[PDB]
Design a protein around this nucleic acid. Structure first.
Ligand code: MG
Lengths: 226, 215
RNA sequence: GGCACUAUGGGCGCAGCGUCAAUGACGCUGACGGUACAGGCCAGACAAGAAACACUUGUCUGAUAUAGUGCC
């Protein structure tokens, strides 16, 4: 039970930059195992990066990182390392370190994984979002309910938080996954369906909080009528 | 050459009690050095099967692995509600290692058509030089859903982006959000902005439209 | 990759000469080359060792081999 892996060292970094991730093992001596790195770009699948062998210290790398990344271990610290050099936007991912098990107990399957540390490579500067109402109206009405929302636009880096009516409104909310625009800034929208009969009586205010740029924005969304 | 691992299906809809078989095909012999992993959203993967057919310790017995040559199948004898997840095969026969692209197991329900909504750009936005038009498809099933923008009946390519929610925990439907991004100059060169939605629950494709400058 | 045929300086022959993680191998040229052996070295695959490789110890194969040719 007591086996655990803790990745650390992630962060933002510009293209061409470098970063060193660490992997603190506990519950076992790191000298007798193979240690791997596995990454997962946001919304994508797993991608094996590198590994180091016990007793030999032999190292293996994926094609997409050969010549830029270096895995190593310091067995006196019980820690593994991933030095990443001349990083590229394609390297943006959650980076996992994993233990390959003992041969006789689990073959070569990775039996323990850390919870990962996030590496973001971007040219983008820190930038608070612009918030724009998605006004309810006809063309956003389906019988008894109307849809309405806020467009949270052109921010970096992730994440934003969006609440409706200062948290009081939660049911019917869909806050969509953000999409990364070719400008390198993110954009998301958040929408809630409500009884159309309440559009005249209840105000609706999306609260957008972006701690990286230390910005808080409250937008009242109002119906469009004629 | 790198050994390729390619899984099938890439997504699979089932209900509790279903027998599920996910396959993965190595591009060359990988003998039996194949592992299967389960990953739930926001959590790190967990090992299920090692050496292609050995149940990893502590893993429920309904999971099993199976091999014929380069054909690898993970099956779940009887799906339980905690089995909805993404699964991965991995070859560790040779360096560099390879994962398959992953098979998502989602909850099957009856077909639900999207209710489709459209939102013209805000006045606040148009003041800024940008025009964003947003199309919402709300609470539908299944997830496959073509969203097609038309501007004065011209089909749009290359200027829209989509995002989909995860399957809802309560009605296990989806919701999608398509945004058409235009320069303000481009937006004022046209009249009729339309969202065409194509989905299994609709008899024929539904469209929502507006004319720039409508009250 | 297989099958048949041909030939074989230990897988390591002598002597120089060059490259390399040099009580090793690898490539050159020269000269020599009746046998058998035996150790030892070495190469290749593999097993176990907390072990994919490397390391240690062990196992199997090195004429049941290895070059050439022909054929599928
Ligand atoms: Mg010839």
């Amino acid at each position: 039970s007591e086996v655990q892996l803790v990745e650390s060292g992630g962060g933002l970094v510009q293209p061409g930059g470098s970063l060193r991730l660490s992997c603190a093992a506990s519950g076992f001596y790191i000298s007798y195992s193979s240690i791997h790195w596995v990454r997962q770009a946001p919304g994508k699948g797993l991608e094996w990066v590198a590994s180091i062998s016990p007793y030999s210290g032999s190292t293996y790398y994926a094609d997409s990182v050969k010549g830029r990344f270096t895995i190593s271990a310091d067995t006196s610290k019980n820690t593994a390392y991933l030095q990443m050099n001349s990083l590229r936007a394609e390297d943006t991912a959650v980076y996992y370190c994993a233990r390959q098990g003992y041969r006789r107990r689990s073959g070569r399957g990775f039996d323990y994984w850390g919870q990962g540390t996030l590496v973001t490579v971007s040219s983008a500067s820190t930038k608070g979002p612009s918030v724009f109402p998605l006004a309810p109206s006809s063309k956003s009405t389906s019988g008894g309910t109307a849809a309405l929302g806020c467009l949270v636009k052109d921010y970096f880096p992730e994440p934003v938080t969006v609440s409706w009516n200062s948290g009081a409104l939660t049911s019917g909310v869909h806050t969509f996954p953000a999409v990364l625009q070719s400008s390198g800034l993110y954009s998301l929208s958040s929408v809630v369906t409500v009884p159309s009969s309440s559009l005249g009586t209840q105000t609706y205010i999306c609260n957008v909080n972006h701690k990286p740029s230390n910005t808080k924005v409250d937008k009242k969304v109002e119906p469009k009528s004629c | 050459s790198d050994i390729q691992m390619t899984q099938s299906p890439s997504s699979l809809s089932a209900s509790v009690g279903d027998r599920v078989t996910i396959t993965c095909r190595a591009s060359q012999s990988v003998s039996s050095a194949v592992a299967w992993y389960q990953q739930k959203p926001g959590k790190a993967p967990k090992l299920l099967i090692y050496s292609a057919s050995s149940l990893y310790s502590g893993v429920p017995s309904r999971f099993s692995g199976s091999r014929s040559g380069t054909d690898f199948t993970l099956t779940i004898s009887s799906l339980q509600p905690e089995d909805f997840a993404t699964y991965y095969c991995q070859q560790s026969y040779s360096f560099p290692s390879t994962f398959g692209q992953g098979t998502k197991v989602e909850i099957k329900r009856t077909v639900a058509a999207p209710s489709v909504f459209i939102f013209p750009p805000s006045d606040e936005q148009l003041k800024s030089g940008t025009a964003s038009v947003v199309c919402l498809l709300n609470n539908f099933y299944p997830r496959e859903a073509k969203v097609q923008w038309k501007v004065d009946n011209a089909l749009q390519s290359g200027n829209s982006q989509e995002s989909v929610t995860e399957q809802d925990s309560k009605d296990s439907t989806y919701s999608l959000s398509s945004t058409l991004t235009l320069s303000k100059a481009d937006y004022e060169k046209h009249k009729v902005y339309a969202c065409e939605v194509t989905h299994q629950g609709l008899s024929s494709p539904v469209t929502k439209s507006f004319n720039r400058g409508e009250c």
